[PDB]
Amino acid sequence: PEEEDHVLVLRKSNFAEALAAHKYLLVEFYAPWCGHCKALAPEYAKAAGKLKAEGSEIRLAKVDATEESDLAQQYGVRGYPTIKFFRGDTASPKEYTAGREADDIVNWLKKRTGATTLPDGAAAESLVESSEVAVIGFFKDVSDSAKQFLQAAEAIDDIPFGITSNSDVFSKYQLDKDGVVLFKKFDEGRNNFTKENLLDFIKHNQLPLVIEFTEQTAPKIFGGTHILLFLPKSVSDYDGKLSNFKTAAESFKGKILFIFIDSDHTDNQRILEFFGLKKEECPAVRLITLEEEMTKYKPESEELTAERITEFCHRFLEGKIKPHLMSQELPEDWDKQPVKVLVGKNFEDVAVFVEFYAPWCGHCKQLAPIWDKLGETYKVIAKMDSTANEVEAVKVHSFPTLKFFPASADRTVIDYNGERTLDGFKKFLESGGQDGAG
């Protein structure tokens, strides 16, 4: 195997050889273009040098997952900075989700080899705030349930479980009996507690209610229905709107994820324009589902407050919440003109004969007096601005593809192909659509 800066290089010819030879090997399925792999490679080399200079059998190795996609396809690797480790007989590698630096890897491998201990005179700081979410396990006999707690501690590698046997720590953390408390630095800081309810409790309390939309947080968001909020950071009462969003997030924590995104930054304007909102409403609330189909939902009440945003997720859970479309509704003076407009909003209740025109084409500009005269003579014929609205039944590559609307809602598509004159359409409408259609 090729060794560079004490890092084995695997190109499907030595990966199996390296894993069968080195029992304790750290795996990296990196990519040439990814900036995460670009930053990880010096850290990977530093950790490989730290392990190699020490007298330990563990080392590090990188695999180009782009050129070696079979390893990613067999294992199930879905990320480029993904770090894994294969020990004995086939087992799932430890999902490395901690800090990707060298000494962090050195501390992390000790957990996977088979909790952390610190002196109790750390001024009650190091044990609790060693990391962002650090759990301390309290037990007088570090048994029947203590061994179960230790097994749960060893179940998750990414959580730095604590060991406590000193008597003053039990009283200082105010526990009459043995228990598990999750500590954090963002939401509450303390959450006191089948063999799975403890893991569910830790995963539920570890989850932050609100997430600032950034590059770093983004892979964890889709890793786990993200109700967004295009709230400017410099908006009027940013704190109050954010507190209302937090109170909304307290109602729905795990099923619906709450993300607040600053609309002031131009890097988020692409996210703004993906939903269609060109910063029309600063406190606007949109829910996006990304399960194989991007369906951006529309809240029922645009009069939105803390309660409205709070129960909007319940409204979405009811299933009655409709998707959002950029289709304008019925115009103000539709009744005055003999030809009326049946928009995509009214394309089912009111939409008789429909047509799908476009103000783009100059031939449609020339036909506008002709279509005015046809409607003036026939004083229902519907023109539809499909550039702004959307057609659900069919698509129009050639936009004046006339679909003759039937009677009694037995929908059929028959293409009129006349000469675009003021008399041909009158002759088509003189037969009631029986002649000239299709």
Binding site: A31, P32, W33, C34, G35, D64, A65, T66, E67, S69, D70, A72, Q73, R78, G79, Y80, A218, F222, Q269, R270, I271, E273, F274, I288, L290, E291, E292, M294, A358, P359, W360, C361, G362, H363, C364, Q366, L367, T387, H397, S398, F399, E419, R420
Partner: protein, 781 residues
């Protein structure tokens, strides 16, 4: 055994294919035929009495020239009695042994008697029989009382020259209504169903009533008459009348001022273009060569294209003797010669051996020498797709391209052979192309990659896609972005794998935003068009790591749109305009693709690729023919009158009639680029379908000059006053007239002449591209 008194008619029809319409018709030649019998060898006498020509469309009545002309006047003095002069035939087991007649007569009058005697030479079986047409796979379908004779006219071996295509059918179901011993009626359907025409021949020989000793039949033919000499049963080529009179001072002078360079846009000018080609095909070598001796050079390229569009033995020698390849003054004439040879629907090996000898010759212009090799690969591609790759010329040409590319000593030769291999479509150039795709030179690899893009899915394997992966993913070295996107376009189109789509979508965002917008738009255009590759993309997008809106939201200027100009469940025509801009928004590779499909098959109709950097160059494709790419600068752009299709199967009908099914389609193009930049695509489709039936004493014709104009002009409305690039793309089609024609003839060497005319104006609309481009363009609106 005795004299048989039968009546005969020769029904000739020239339909337009409507289904039931008496718009155009042909003459009916009628006679009362007396047949007398003069081992299974037998000799008979066939005599034509009461021979007269009548019309079957008597609705007009006396509008034709059959009124006031005697039957003697119509056919002439000698030919009326020549048909009335008896003819002989030797028949063995229902097949033609030998055909005997006086032979001192016109060819066409003998053809009628040759078609008349074939009804007694018939048999449930299949063979190559002897008849009027020649040697064809003849399907005998015997019924319980009658027999159906189906003749595969594709399998006919005759001397007549029979050769973006024209489909045809040649159903020749012939019914010999036979009751007791011989023909009591004949129902001979001779439909040639090929803008379409149904030219129908029919003959009705009905028996009404009836009333030399020797062991050898060899001398009996001489004993009846000494002039009864040997002649074939197959008809011969004749031209009793003017026919294709050359008339260089007369006929060419008529079309000299109807093909002027100033009115090439007009479809009336292009209508005379196809007429003069039909004259030159039935013309001798010295006749065509004399026209170009003192012709004007300004109207010469139309004549050069017209001569080259004939594609006969003498005309090819005439144009090659006229055009001196060593002469560097006539750049355009050889270039028009090469293009028309490239656009020839039926190129020949002698032309290929000539063009090989041209490359072996001392060609003064290297661009023409490059153009020869580009056409040489085009001829090889047509021949190897016509089961001719094993030819002595083809292997010589393949070794010129393959060996020259493998062993290259000059930079221009590599660029010449890359363009040549692009037209060649040789599967053995793939190891050379993948070598040149990874060679590290920009234009060389990009031309090779686009050459690889011309290759199909069976010609691209997993190893080929893995070879292009290192170009796109940049595993080993850096490549230019146009090469990687083209390589990504090949992989996504030519059966991508699950991980291949998986890795490409993950690359979006990490690439520069100029490439990110285009690469997103390519996958976006994949999803919109419901491609078969999109199902794999849908399985990749099923996971949340690929369907995330972080990658789907990109601020860029590039685009990739594909739509249908026309679509039907039987066939469809597609177009696309995938323009990739730079980081600053400058255009880099705009791919204007024009495609046409017919059922399962499809033909790349056109492709104009405008490329800019900082150089400025354009690449032109016309109907599966990569032309020589044109560079505007470095450090009347496209103009030509050319043919598209040619179906000129000179049929010999079962009744003994000469049917010339000539379908020609030509256009005049004028593509000029001026920079606000516009590119025009001026198309004038002029289809002149002709089906003329002649027998040198009665003439009938039908001409359908369905001519259509078109135009697809793209405008790059770009505003660069502000820091964002306000780039608006718009392809504007202007109004073009649509016209149809129909002519009818019934002559006997004014006549039954009529003209039908229709006219329509097609409204033109701007192409909307995609709605993202529509937002910037609505500032103009």
């Amino acid at each position: 055994d005795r004299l048989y008194k039968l009546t005969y008619s020769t029904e000739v029809l020239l339909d337009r294919g409507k289904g039931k319409l008496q718009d155009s018709v042909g003459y009916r030649i009628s006679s009362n035929v007396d047949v007398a019998l003069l081992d299974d060898d037998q000799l008979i006498q066939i005599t034509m009495k009461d021979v007269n020509v009548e019309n079957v469309n008597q609705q007009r009545g006396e509008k034709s020239i059959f009124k006031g002309k005697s039957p003697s006047k119509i056919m002439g003095k000698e030919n009326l009695e020549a048909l009335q002069r008896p003819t002989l035939l030797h028949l063995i087991h229902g097949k033609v042994k030998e055909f005997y007649s006086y032979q001192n007569e016109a060819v066409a009058i003998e053809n009628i008697k040759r078609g008349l005697a074939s009804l007694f030479q018939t048999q449930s079986g299949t063979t190559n029989e002897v008849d009027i047409s020649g040697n064809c796979k003849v399907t005998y379908q015997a019924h319980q009382d009658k027999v159906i004779k189906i003749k595969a006219l594709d399998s006919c071996k005759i001397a007549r020259s029979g050769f973006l295509g024209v489909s045809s059918k040649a159903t020749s179901v012939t019914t010999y209504k036979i009751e007791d011993s011989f023909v009591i009626a004949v129902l001979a359907e001779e439909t040639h169903n090929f803008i379409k025409g149904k030219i129908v021949s029919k003959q009705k020989l009905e028996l009404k009533t009836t009333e030399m000793s020797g062991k050898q039949a060899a001398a009996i033919i001489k004993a009846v008459d000494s002039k009864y000499t040997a002649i074939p049963i197959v008809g011969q080529v004749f031209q009793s009348h003017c026919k294709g009179c050359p008339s260089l001072s007369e006929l060419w002078r008529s079309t000299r001022k109807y093909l002027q360079p100033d009115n090439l846009s007009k479809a009336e000018a292009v209508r005379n273009f196809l007429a003069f080609i039909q004259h030159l095909r039935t013309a001798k070598k010295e006749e065509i060569l004399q026209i170009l001796k003192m012709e004007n050079k300004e109207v010469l390229p139309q004549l050069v294209d017209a001569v080259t569009s004939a594609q006969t033995s003498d005309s090819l020698e005439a144009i090659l003797d006229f055009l001196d390849f060593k002469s560097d003054s006539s750049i355009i004439l050889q270039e028009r010669f090469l293009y028309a040879c490239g656009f020839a629907s039926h190129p020949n090996e002698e032309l290929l051996r000539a063009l090989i000898s041209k490359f072996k010759g001392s060609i003064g212009s290297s661009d023409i020498r490059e153009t020869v090799m580009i056409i040489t690969g085009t001829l090889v591609r047509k021949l190897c797709q016509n089961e001719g790759c094993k030819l002595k010329a083809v292997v010589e040409a393949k070794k010129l391209i393959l060996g020259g590319l493998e062993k290259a000593e000059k930079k221009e030769d590599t660029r010449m052979y890359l363009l040549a291999l692009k037209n060649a479509l040789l599967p053995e150039g793939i190891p050379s192309l993948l070598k040149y795709a990874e060679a590290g030179e920009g234009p060389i690899s990009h031309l090779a990659t686009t050459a690889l893009q011309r290759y199909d899915l069976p010609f691209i394997t997993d190893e080929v896609k893995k070879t292009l992966n290192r170009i796109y993913h940049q595993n080993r070295k850096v490549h230019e972005k146009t090469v990687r996107t083209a390589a990504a376009a090949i992989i996504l189109n030519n059966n991508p794998s699950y991980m291949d789509v998986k890795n490409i979508l993950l690359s979006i965002g990490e690439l520069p935003q100029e490439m990110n917008k285009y690469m997103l738009a390519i996958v976006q255009d994949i999803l919109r068009f419901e491609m078969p590759a999109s199902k794999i993309v849908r399985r990749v997008l099923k996971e949340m790591v690929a369907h995330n809106y972080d990658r789907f939201s990109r601020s860029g200027s590039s685009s990739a749109y594909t739509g249908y100009i026309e679509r039907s469940p039987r066939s469809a025509s597609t177009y696309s305009l995938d323009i990739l801009y730079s980081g600053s928004g400058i255009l880099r590779r705009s791919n204007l693709n024009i495609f046409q499909y017919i059922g399962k098959a499809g033909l790349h109709g056109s492709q104009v690729v405008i490329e800019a950097q900082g150089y400025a160059g354009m690449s032109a494709i016309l109907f599966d023919v990569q032309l020589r790419p044109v560079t505007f600068f470095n450090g009347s752009v496209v103009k030509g009158l050319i043919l598209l299709i040619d179906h000129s199967q000179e049929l010999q009908l079962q009744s003994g009639l000469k049917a010339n099914i000539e379908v020609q389609g030509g256009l005049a193009i004028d593509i000029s680029g001026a920079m606000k930049t516009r590119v025009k695509n001026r198309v004038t489709v002029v289809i002149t379908t002709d089906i003329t039936v002649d027998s040198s004493f009665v003439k009938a014709g039908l001409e359908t000059s369905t001519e259509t104009e078109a135009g697809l002009e793209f405008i790059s409305t770009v505003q660069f006053s502000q820091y964002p690039f306000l780039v608006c793309m718009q392809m504007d089609k202007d109004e073009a007239p649509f016209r149809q024609f129909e002519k009818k003839y019934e002559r006997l060497s004014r006549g039954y002449v009529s003209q039908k005319r229709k006219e329509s104006v097609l409204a033109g609309c701007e192409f909307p591209l995609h709605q993202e481009n529509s937002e910037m363009c609505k500032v103009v609106f």
